[PDB]
A paper describes a structure:
The enzymatic activity of ANG is several orders of magnitude lower than that of RNase A towards conventional RNase substrates, but essential for its angiogenic effect.
In the T80S ALS variant structure, the position of S80 is well defined in the electron density map and its atoms occupy positions essentially the same as in those of the corresponding atoms in native ANG. In particular, the position of Oγ1 atom of T80 overlaps with the equivalent position of Oγ atom of S80 in the variant structure (more solvent accessible) and retains most of the interactions seen in the wild-type structure.
Author numbering: 2 to 121
The structure:
């Protein structure tokens, strides 16, 4: 077990969204426990998990920068960006759907960190 992998899934994986609008972001950010304080930006990756884990190997990733990995395939993602002045709930979010490759950090063949800089 890797608690950082499980935390990765909680913070950054959502298999099957439908509408990835502002209200999607407000709900899932509350649901995954990311609202006290409001995380300023957070991105969710969609689709299957095997594709995400595959970034940790040659199959679907390349080494990137300082011990990160960058994916070969593009993913459906949604970025939730905090707006308003306050760090505390109610946390209002702007949703930005995207489709591109993702940067992760892996440990023991498992993603444990999502690089958020590429989405801000």
């Amino acid at each position: 077990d890797n608690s950082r992998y499980t935390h990765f899934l909680t913070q950054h994986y959502d298999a099957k969204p439908q509408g990835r609008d502002d209200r999607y972001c407000e709900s899932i950010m509350r649901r995954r426990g990311l609202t006290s304080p409001c995380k300023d930006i957070n991105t969710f990756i969609h689709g299957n998990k095997r594709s995400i884990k595959a970034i940790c190997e040659n199959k679907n990733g390349n080494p990137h920068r300082e011990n990160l990995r960058i994916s070969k395939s593009s993913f459906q993602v949604t970025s939730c960006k905090l707006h308003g002045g306050s760090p505390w709930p109610p946390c209002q979010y702007r949703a930005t759907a995207g489709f591109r490759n993702v940067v992760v950090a892996c440990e023991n063949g498992l993603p444990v960190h999502l690089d958020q800089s590429i989405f801000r």
